[PDB]
Design a protein around this ligand. Sequence first.
Ligand SMILES: Cc1cc2nc3c(=O)[nH]c(=O)nc-3n(C[C@H](O)[C@H](O)[C@H](O)COP(=O)(O)O)c2cc1C
Ligand SMILES: Cc1cc([C@@H](C)NC(=O)c2[nH]cc(C3(c4ccc(C(F)(F)F)nc4)CC3)c2C)n[nH]1
Ligand SMILES: O=C(O)c1cc(=O)[nH]c(=O)[nH]1
Length: 384
Amino acid sequence: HHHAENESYNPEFFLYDIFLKFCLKYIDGEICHDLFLLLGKYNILPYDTSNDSIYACTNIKHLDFINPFGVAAGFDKNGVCIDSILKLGFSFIEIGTITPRGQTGNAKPRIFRDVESRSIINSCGFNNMGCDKVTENLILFRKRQEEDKLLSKHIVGVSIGKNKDTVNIVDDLKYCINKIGRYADYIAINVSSPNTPGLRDNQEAGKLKNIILSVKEEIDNLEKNNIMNDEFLWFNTTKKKPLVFVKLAPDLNQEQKKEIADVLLETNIDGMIISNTTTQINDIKSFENKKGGVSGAKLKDISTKFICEMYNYTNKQIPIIASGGIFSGLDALEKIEAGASVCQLYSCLVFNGMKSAVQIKRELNHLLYQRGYYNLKEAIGRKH
Ligand SMILES: Cc1cc2nc3c(=O)[nH]c(=O)nc-3n(C[C@H](O)[C@H](O)[C@H](O)COP(=O)(O)O)c2cc1C
Ligand SMILES: Cc1cc([C@@H](C)NC(=O)c2[nH]cc(C3(c4ccc(C(F)(F)F)nc4)CC3)c2C)n[nH]1
Ligand SMILES: O=C(O)c1cc(=O)[nH]c(=O)[nH]1
């Protein structure tokens, strides 16, 4: 895997795969992740030195993604590794999920990998330093961005959720908006983690509608009450108020999916993230003892079908962010042709490591060539 065919700051430098195979075999998952974050904290991760193809750029409303690959929520929960993760070759990252107060999360061990099936199962429970500290972390990023031209088009979304013991989710969502919203290019509303009791209940149509409208109202009030401030309000990439996405769980029946789509149309959500982890996977022997949501290759078909379903149920009016089992350029094109405008990676970064973005971007470009597309946007929804 000598990178020279396509030194150490190259994401495909041959030692990374060697270290990763060893880590995946012998080293606890959460310790591997700590080591990754530590390398990123000290800016010693490798970095991608390519200009991305202009023919694989994509957008959701005014968000102009330089390429179609971001890192999904839950990878940099605290926003401590934003620059270094982006510089691996990703166009955006969704930090969080954050909650108003910090939490250490559910008890360990709580994360388990299965290399054979390229799957993960987790019961993390929203481990994060809390909205106020993560807001300081994001502000530090936004200040570095302001000075580094190389980062000026990269996007940062923030996933928001509730503390375990909070009764009304809306209170926690509004708290996060008023503290971190002005530094976000978009807000992702997390009503789909399987590891916070009762959170998924908020996918019910009536509750979801009130959640979306409350979040939009709070963002709109943030603007109204602060535009005239001397310091410009939107200290983000877009220089506009954050868009609002909802992240949905794949474990829903067809009637729930249809009622949610009706709500998304009425409330004018800006995007839907399809999807979070699933609790409906049984045939992973090494996970049989274990609690939580499953990610990875065994989630691919489930979530791709879910994209097709919500694209049609929303009559193609709500942009889609794809999450679930994306590893290859083929996987990515299947999500886009199913309806997605943009892809998020998580398991691919765990199992393929530092080369994840370089490799998948290369694979997608070649496929767009072979398939005869002029650009990526032409492929969106072409399955339908
Ligand atoms: C350890 C772990 C923590 C996660 N934490 C979050 C989270 O905090 N918020 C969220 O919206 N999704 C979270 N996810 C889900 C991912 O963002 C992603 O939606 C999911 O893993 C499916 O994508 P993949 O198959 O590419 O891994 C987490 C996933 C894992 C494995
Ligand atoms: C929230 C959460 C997620 C997790 C688990 C699922 N994350 C991981 O397994 C993980 N994350 C990052 C890595 C990579 C890495 C890590 C270390 C090294 C080395 F340099 F040390 F070799 N190389 C490569 C893949 C790049 C891995 C294997 N736990 N908790
Ligand atoms: O923090 C977690 O446990 C978590 C959140 C989420 O949204 N999805 C997930 O799989 N885990």
